[PDB]
Amino acid sequence: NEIGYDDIGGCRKQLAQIKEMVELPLRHPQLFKAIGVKPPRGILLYGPPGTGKTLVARAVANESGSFFFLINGPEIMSKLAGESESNLRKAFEEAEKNAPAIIFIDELDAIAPKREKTHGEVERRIVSQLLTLMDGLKQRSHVIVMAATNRPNSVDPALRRFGRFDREIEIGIPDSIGRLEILRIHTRNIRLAEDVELEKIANEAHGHVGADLASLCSEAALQQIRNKMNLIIDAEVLNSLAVTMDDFRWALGKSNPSALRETTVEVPNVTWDDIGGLENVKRELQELVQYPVEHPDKFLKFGMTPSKGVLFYGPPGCGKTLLAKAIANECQANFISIKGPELLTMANVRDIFDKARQAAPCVLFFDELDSIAKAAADRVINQLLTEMDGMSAKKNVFIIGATNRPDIIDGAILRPGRLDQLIYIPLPDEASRVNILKANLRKSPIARDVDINFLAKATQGFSGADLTEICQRACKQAIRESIEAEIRAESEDPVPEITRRHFEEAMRFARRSVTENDVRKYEMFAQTLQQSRGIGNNF
């Protein structure tokens, strides 16, 4: 029952990073003496609630082999004024007496809030004592101080300094692969039916931290019990209890994960095959994003630093969002998406650029920039420009912007050193429209009588989103006939695929979302955005 590294999933990188700082010095002390390293003695784990950073603490407690002392934030603050000071002092004194040792301070924000913003005098005295104790740890003393907080910005800045907590590890939101690892860990003692495919549950559990995935496994078991209890304890029933995929899907539907609104920094699942049409832009994006990462030596050879800012602009529904996700996928680079409405609803723009820096190859995408232009907006745009200037081209963070309104985009964002690579995403041509329909219909069963070539030549001027709407309306016709066919059978297989007749009905009321007059305006700005940075038509 004792927790170990095997009970933690989704943070393989972080655990190895912790081991290198807690276990490796003790196993091989001569490595650090040989090279002259100052091994870290302050480690701060941070991340949203439920990510498993108290679990990591329990793992290090039971695996490090060094004396472990656990300080709980609320426990210290629940004591009287004098007794909270003594417990902190006794914590460090015992650690130095039993070196090597690890002091773990869970819920550091409870002990060490910002002194400027702290009201009580006793609380501020505890923060001061912790700083004194942290500074009182001699280099000889083999004492590593670990801390965990889900509010890192609420901690006193003095503690996040050299010599004090100076190494920060993010136990963040797990990705799809990590979610599967957690589910496997939490289903080891739960009977599962043969139809349970935890891979699908992991892929569908967006926004779920390990704490949420633990609840999901628990709830699915209860739903299994509910089904049996409702029908009905006989031993046959007890031996027939096995969580089925239906229970997991029921649990996933009712689940309300706590990390839905957190920014995601995972590699997207969109590939080139999801776009297809924009061949030239694919090649251009590879050179702008892929080459600096894969072939950094060649750029050093030719002596010119790559520009790491791009701007997609064009008519709505032409794949600007898909392109940003596909390129990050090809490079296997993290992807942060910040839609324009999110920016306006929000020192938080600085955090986004901080997250992008932590993700070493990262594509930082600012979608729907037209919202800022159509609009706080001045503060948001100026903050973006300052952060872009603070992002060096030598760091593998690529900034991409997308706008459906190149007519109202501030020229400061196009300045060299900023989104100066201007890529125009036009309406698809007939050949492109064929590929878009093929891409959209991959998952759908289509009858042999459907000619995508005919659809492409009928959807002249149709944006990529419009073509998706035709497919959606084609499927709805198939579902309608499927339901009607089922009623006839019950009241007295029938439609297995999406036939041509469905597409005929789908295209009856279809109209292009971008008018030819609008296309003329977009083609005008394909020639004048580069020149929309001086006086222009303002005088």
Ligand X SMILES: Nc1ncnc2c1ncn2[C@@H]1O[C@H](COP(=O)(O)OP(=O)(O)OP(O)(O)=S)[C@@H](O)[C@H]1O
**234 annotated among ligand-binding-site residues:** no
Residue 129 burial by Cβ neighbours in a 10 Å radius (0-12, 13-18, 19+): middle
**106 annotated among ligand-binding-site residues:** yes
> Cis bond leading into 39, ω under 30°?
no
**Can residue 35 be called a binding residue for a copy of itself (CB under 8 A)?**
yes
3-state secondary structure of 419: coil
DSSP 339: -
Residues 153-182 that bind ligand X (CB under 6 A): 161-162, 182
Site pattern 285..314 for a copy of itself (x: CB under 8 A): --x---x---x--xx-xxxx-xx-------
Residues 41-60 that bind ligand X (CB under 6 A): 49-55
Residue 534, φ and ψ in degrees, nearest 5: -115, -140
**Can residue 389 be called a binding residue for a copy of itself (CB under 8 A)?**
yes
**Can residue 319 be called a binding residue for ligand X (CB under 6 A)?**
yes
Residues 420-459 that bind ligand X (CB under 6 A): 436, 439-440
Site pattern 374..403 for ligand X (x: CB under 6 A): ----------------------------x-
Residues 58-117 that bind a copy of itself (CB under 8 A): 72-75, 77-78, 85, 107, 110, 113, 115-116
* Residue 141, both tokens: 């003393």
Q: Report how far residue 91's alpha carbon sits from residue 82's, in angstroms, rounded to the nearest whole number.
A: 14
**Can residue 422 be called a binding residue for a copy of itself (CB under 8 A)?**
no
Q: Which is nearer to a copy of itself, 26 or 98 (CB)?
A: 26
**Can residue 404 be called a binding residue for ligand X (CB under 6 A)?**
yes
Site pattern 368..387 for a copy of itself (x: CB under 8 A): x-xx--xxx-xx-xxx-xx-
DSSP-assigned letters across all residues of 120-166: -HHHHHHHHHHHHHHHT--SSS-EEEEEEES-GGGB-GGGSSTTSS-
Length of the chain: 539
Total Cβ atoms within 10 A of residue 253: 8
Of ligand X, Mg ion, a copy of itself, none, which one sits near residue 193, judging by CB under 5 to 8 A according to partner kind?
A: none
Residues 255-284 that bind ligand X (CB under 6 A): 275-278
Closest distance of CB 158 from ligand X, Å: 7
Per-residue three-class SS string for 438-482: HHHCCCCCECCCCCHHHHHHHCCCCCHHHHHHHHHHHHHHHHHHH
Of ligand X, a copy of itself, Mg ion, none, which one sits near residue 132, judging by CB under 5 to 8 A according to partner kind?
A: a copy of itself
Q: Report how far residue 489's alpha carbon sits from residue 456's, in angstroms, rounded to the nearest whole number.
A: 36
C-alpha dist (Å) from residue 101 to 22, 28, 41, 145: 9, 16, 10, 8
3-state secondary structure of 105: strand
Q: Are 108 and 155 in contact (CB under 8 A)?
A: yes
Closest distance of CB 238 from ligand X, Å: 25
Instruction: Give residues in contact with ligand X (CB under 6 A).
Output: 7-11, 49-55, 150, 161-162, 182, 185, 210-211, 214, 275-278, 316-322, 402, 404, 415-416, 436, 439-440, 464-465, 468
Pick out the residues of the known binding site for Mg(2+).
54, 106-107, 321, 367
